[PDB]
């Protein structure tokens, strides 16, 4: 069935891992350097003037696959607001995601401001916090300063009749081998995302699944509601 | 050196590639004038800076959409955002305002490009837009409406050359119908040719890929010469 929420709020929560992190940045990229063993990723996402998503995802390999697994949980929606009314456009904008080193706890911290085009012609804002701790217990990577500067379109595939989007995304690291996770990365690796969703109590599920290098930073991804 | 940043040739470098939805498929002039085509030409003021004009032909060579484009640029400023190479490489989202322009039995379209300059500031592109069939036979005029567009520039690890790689979609908004849109039902595959002169700068570029209608999707990548 059809999502009870706008799919682009969905974005940002459906992996950073495969941002292109260049050469010379290598040594900040603490996203790889957490793989295979995987790192948690939870976020507060505020919505302005209206709900809130808070979100808890493990993102690891599972075999030769990438896998996104996410809980998420949205509170306080405006019945007749952006969100539940279905008033956001279907499209994506470019963000930086700001990043800095969270060393009390051996991994990263992230504020950001994601801005979704409304069909007014306005604008929502949707504030982000976001926090990444390591499953493992092997190094990993605490990088100084910089930002991820990201591109998505969404698009749709026409005979598919359930609710989906389909998502391609290019993310490169700016603002400024290193790790055996690194190297698991050096090909086009697949996907596997997994979310489980309570909004306002509406209950919803949405897979996805394709492909990511992290050599372009580049996703392409199918995701479907399996509500 | 390709003498301007490559996100100033975007708008130069097929909106017969736009998805017009089922609803909205008699306001579609692009492709009622194909396979014959249109001509279609623009003035693209860089506000505090130079100006673009373009003039493309856009036809079918058989199984081929091609844009052949010839550019001049000049006024520009010798340390301006774009002879002096500021403009990140992206590309932001726009609507293509489009009317009816009854008298030349074709369209305009109307929109300012925002290009993002390496400090922070926005470069503006005023694009002023004319499309006429090349054809006699009948086209539509549709009513006034907009093209939403999204692109991303990305590059080939594999290529050596000055290039870009380009994916965009496009959708109709803001409201077969003809025996052109026909022509677009599957994949179709692109050529474009650019030809240009910015403040006696001279370059062509080539590009070669695809587009799908139905998606209203661009694939291309484009070389520089």
């Known amino acids: 069935g059809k999502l009870p929420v706008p799919w682009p709020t969905l974005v940002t929560t459906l992996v950073q891992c495969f941002s292109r992190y260049p050469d010379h940045m290598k040594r900040h990229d603490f996203f790889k350097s957490a793989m295979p063993e995987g790192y948690v990723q939870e976020r507060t996402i505020s919505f302005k003037d209206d709900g809130k998503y808070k979100t808890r995802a493990v993102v690891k390999f ?41 060393k009390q706890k051996n991994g990263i911290k992230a504020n950001f401001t994601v801005r979704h085009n409304v069909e007014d012609g306005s604008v929502q804002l949707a504030d982000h916090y976001q926090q990444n701790t390591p499953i493992g217990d092997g190094p990993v990577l605490l990088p100084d300063n910089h930002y991820l500067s990201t591109q998505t379109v969404l698009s749709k595939d026409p005979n598919e009749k359930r609710d989906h989007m389909v998502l391609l995304e290019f993310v490169t690291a700016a603002g400024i081998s290193a790790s055996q996770g690194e190297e698991l990365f050096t090909g086009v690796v697949p996907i596997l995302v997994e979310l489980d969703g309570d909004v306002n109590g509406h209950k919803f599920s949405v897979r996805g699944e394709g492909e990511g290098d992290a050599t372009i930073g580049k996703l392409t991804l199918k995701f479907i509601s399996t509500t």
């Open 62 to 102: 599972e075999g030769d696959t990438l896998v996104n697994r996410i809980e998420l949980k949205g509170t306080d929606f405006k019945e007749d607001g952006n969100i539940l009314g279905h008033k956001l456009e279907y499209n994506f904008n470019s963000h930086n995601v700001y990043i800095t080193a969270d």
